[PDB]
Design a binder for this molecule. Structure first.
Ligand SMILES: O=C(O)[C@H](Cc1ccccc1)CC(O)(O)C[N+](=O)[O-]
Ligand SMILES: O=C(O)[C@H](Cc1ccccc1)CC(O)(O)C[N+](=O)[O-]
Ligand SMILES: O=C(O)[C@H](Cc1ccccc1)CC(O)(O)C[N+](=O)[O-]
Ligand SMILES: [Zn+2]
Ligand SMILES: [Zn+2]
Ligand SMILES: [Zn+2]
Lengths: 307, 307, 307
C-alpha cells in the first residue's frame, strides 16, 4: 500500500507492513502525527509510538498500548485501525476533535515486536517476549507480568519455561522498561489503556491485590458506560470490573503499575470472541472489532478530558 | 594506510579508504588479485569486484557480495578483512590453496556504494540504494528485494517510501543488474554468497516461496557444517535453514535468483549480534566476526570444490 | 487436431495429447488462459496447471485437481472438457461470466502424470505415483493419502507394496507438494475441488476424523444443491456427506488438508458409474459425465463467489 487509503484494514499484517503504515500516516498527516522511537526490543528492533497532537507543550495525555502479547493479533490490527481513525475523525467528529484539541494521544501498536515477528515466522500462538537470560533453555517473558506492581507475587510464574513467566526482576524486559521510562519522563498522562485479546472484558486496577482502588466508584461507572457504548454497535457483550475479581489474581500487570503512578483512568481491554476462535480471530472481524472498541475507548477519553 | 599491512582492520572505514585499499592489495599481489569494474552506481560511482585467480580459463567460480544493505557496516569491514585473508592464506593453507587452484573467487566488498557514502555523511542507518524514482519524493530501493526471483510478490513493499521497497521492476537497480549481467556472462559460478548483518543466521534458497529446493538436504548439511566451523572459534551461535522457514517470506532476494540460475551453493549470512548493538556493532568486534565468518565461508567453498 | 474446435472430447487421450491440448487452448484464448508449470513429477515430467483469469492481482481463486489417481481416466477426460467449457461460456453464461470477472480458476488436468503414462503403457489400473522406495521392490504412493492432514493415521497403509500406501512422510510425493506450495504461496483460494472416479459421491471435509467441521451445515447444503444440479441433466444420482461417514475413515486426503488451510469450500467428487464399468468407463460416457459434473461444480463456484 502506497497510501493509508490503500492499506487493507480487513486483513492481518506483518511487522514490516505495520511499520511502513506508520510512515505513510505521518507523511500524510504531518501536523497531527509523529513517530517516536522509545527504545529497542531485545532483538534490536525499534520500538515505535505514534504521537497524535495538535500542539501545546506536553498536554495531558492518553496512553494506549497494544500487542504486548504477540499472538493477540486482533489488537495490533485494531491499533492500525485506531491510528487511521484518529486522522479521519479529527475535525470531523465534534467529540474526538475536542479531545485532540486539548490532549495528546500516544499509541503503541506493536509493544512486543520480537514476539510479533515470531508469530509470523515460527509460532502463531507465541505470547511472550524473545529474551534469553540465565541458565535456562526456554525463552521469553510474559511482558504483562513484568511490571513493577506486585512483581513476583501470586498471579505469575517463576519458571522461565512457563507461558506466564514474570522474568528475573521488575522491568527486566526492555519492552516494558521503555514504556515505564517514557511515561515517567512525560509526567502528564491522565489515561493508560492496555489492549489485549479475547474474553471480552474491560477491567480496572489491581489484579495483584484484593485491595479496592480509591477511585473504584468512578472507574466502575466509566467501565459500565464504555461497555454499553461498545455494545451499541454490534451487540458485543463485555463484562467489567477489577482484574482480580473478574478473571483472577494476576501480578506485575501494566494497569496496576500505571494506576499506582497516579494515572487515574487505567483500564485493560480483552477484545473479541469468547472462545469461538480465540486468538485466531477471523480477519473478517478486524474492522467490526476495531469500530466497536473505538466507541468504548472514546467513552473513556471523554471522561478523561472532563475530569 | 600506505600498505595493506598498515591498514586498520579493527575500525570502520569510508568508501574512499576501502577503494584505496583495493588498489594497495592489487599492487601488492598482482599475480593473484585484480580489480574489475562491473558497472556504475545510480550516482555514477564505480562498482568494484576483486577477482582472485591463479590462472585457468573461466574456471568454476565463487561469488561473494557484501554491503548490499549500506547500514550493515560489519559486512563491508568483513569484506575488507576477507580480501586481505585470501592473499595471506593462498599458498600457505592447504585447503584454501586447493580451492584457488581450481576455482576463482569474485569478491564485491561494497555492493551498494551510494548507500554506503550516505551512511557516512547523512544517515548511519540508511539501507536502500539512492536511486530517485519518478512519481515519488522518497529515495532508494531495497536492493535485495529487487532481484528477478519472485519479484513483486509477498515479502516486499510496493511503496517507494518503504524500507523494503522492491523497486519499479526486476533488476531496475543498476547495482543489481550489474551483478546479474556479470554472473550471467561468466556462466560458470558454482557458489553465490550474500553477506548481511545481525541475527546470526546462515540461510539457503527461497524466501519468496514455500517450495523446498531440490537440493535442500545437501544445502542443509552444508549449512550445518558451516555453522559449526564458525562456532568453533568463539562460540558464536548461528541458526540455519531456508529463508522462509527460518525468518519469513521475502521476495526479490539475491540467492533465490542465483539458485534459480543453476548456482547450487547459494547462501546468505546474517552476521553478528542478536540485537545488543544491532547494526551499530562495535568496531572491537570486526576482526573476531570476520575471523569466525571466514571459517564458515571456507567450509562452503570446500563443499563446492569437492562437489 | 490443430484446434481445440476439432479436438475429440468423446475419446480418451494420452499425456502428450492432453499437454498439446493445453497449448492449443492457450494459443486460441491468450487473454483468458495461461499454462503454469508448478513442478516436475518424480520421473521429471512437467506438472501443468491451466489458469483462467480475466485480470486482477491474486484474485480469490478456485482450485480443481483431477487425475491424482491415474486409472480414473474419466477425470482427466472431464478436465479437458472443463477447460474448453470455460472458454466457451465466459461471455455467454451470465453466472459463469460473473464468477470469472471476480475470480480465478486453476485447473490441473493430470495431477499424476507418471502414473497416467503408466496406465497407457504398462498397467491400465495403476493408481499410485511412480516414486521408487529405498528398501522395497514395490513402486509408488497413493498421492491422495500423502497430504498433511491426519497423515499416517488409520485410513491408509504404511506398507510400500499396498495400493493405499501413504508414503514416507506427509508431502513426500512431489505431485502433492507442488500443489501445497502453489496454494500456500497464493494464499487466496476460496474453494478446493478434487475430482476422482466412480461411486457417484460428493463429499466434504474429514475422512481422517469423525470430528464434524465448523462449516458442516453450509457445506452439506451446498453439496445437496450441487448433486441436485448434477442430477437435473441426465438423472444421475449422487450421494453426499462427509468422507468418513459416507465411504470410510481415510487419512492424508487432499480436502482435509485444504479445509485445514482455511479453504472453506473443499469438496471431493467421485464420478460416474457405481460399478458396472468402474474405472473402465466407456468413452461414450465422457461428455455426458463432464456436462452433468460441470453443473455441480458451477453450483459450488456460485456459492463461493457470494460468500
Ligand atoms: O492474564 C493474562 O496474561 C491476560 C489477561 C489479563 C489482561 C490484563 C491484566 C491481567 C490479565 C491473558 C491474555 O489477555 O494475555 C490472553 N492470553 O494470551 O492468555
Ligand atoms: O530481510 C532482509 O531484508 C534481511 C534478511 C534477509 C537476508 C537474506 C535473504 C532474505 C532476508 C535483513 C537485513 O539483513 O537486511 C538486515 N536489515 O533488516 O537491514
Ligand atoms: O479412498 C480413495 O482412494 C478414493 C475414495 C476417496 C476419495 C476422496 C477422499 C477419500 C477417499 C477411491 C478412489 O476415488 O481413489 C477410487 N479408487 O479406489 O482408485
Ligand atoms: Zn494479553
Ligand atoms: Zn542485509
Ligand atoms: Zn481417486
Amino acid at each position: 500500500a502506497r497510501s493509508t487509503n490503500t492499506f487493507n484494514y480487513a486483513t492481518y499484517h506483518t511487522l514490516d507492513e505495520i511499520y511502513d503504515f506508520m510512515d505513510l500516516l505521518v507523511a500524510e498527516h504531518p501536523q497531527l502525527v509523529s513517530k517516536l522511537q522509545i527504545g529497542r526490543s531485545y532483538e534490536g528492533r525499534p520500538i515505535y509510538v505514534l504521537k497524535f497532537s495538535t500542539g501545546g507543550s506536553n498536554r495531558p495525555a492518553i496512553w494506549i498500548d497494544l500487542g504486548i502479547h504477540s499472538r493477540e493479533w486482533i489488537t495490533q490490527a485494531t491499533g492500525v485501525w485506531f491510528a487511521k481513525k484518529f486522522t479521519e475523525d479529527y475535525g470531523q467528529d465534534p467529540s474526538f476533535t475536542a479531545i485532540l484539541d486539548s490532549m495528546d494521544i500516544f499509541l503503541e501498536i506493536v509493544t512486543n515486536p520480537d514476539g510479533f515477528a515470531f508469530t509470523h515466522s515460527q509460532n502463531r500462538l507465541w505470547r511472550k517476549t524473545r529474551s534469553v537470560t540465565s541458565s535456562s533453555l526456554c525463552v521469553g517473558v510474559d511482558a504483562n507480568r513484568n511490571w513493577d506492581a506486585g512483581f513476583g507475587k501470586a498471579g505469575a510464574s517463576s519458571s522461565p519455561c512457563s507461558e506466564t513467566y514474570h522474568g528475573k526482576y521488575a522491568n527486566s524486559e526492555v519492552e516494558v522498561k521503555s514504556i515505564v521510562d517514557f511515561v515517567k519522563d512525560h509526567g502528564n498522562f491522565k489515561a493508560f489503556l492496555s489492549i489485549h485479546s479475547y474474553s471480552q472484558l474491560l477491567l480496572y486496577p489491581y489484579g495483584y491485590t484484593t485491595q479496592s482502588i480509591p477511585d473504584k466508584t468512578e472507574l466502575n461507572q466509566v467501565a459500565k458506560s464504555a461497555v454499553e457504548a461498545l455494545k451499541s454497535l454490534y451487540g458485543t457483550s463485555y463484562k467489567y470490573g477489577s482484574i482480580i475479581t473478574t478473571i483472577y489474581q494476576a501480578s506485575g500487570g501494566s494497569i496496576d503499575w500505571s494506576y499506582n503512578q497516579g494515572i487515574k483512568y487505567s483500564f485493560t481491554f480483552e477484545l473479541r470472541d469468547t472462545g469461538r476462535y480465540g486468538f485466531l480471530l477471523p480477519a473478517s472481524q478486524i474492522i467490526p472489532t476495531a469500530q466497536e472498541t473505538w466507541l468504548g475507548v472514546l467513552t473513556i477519553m471523554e471522561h478523561t478530558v472532563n475530569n
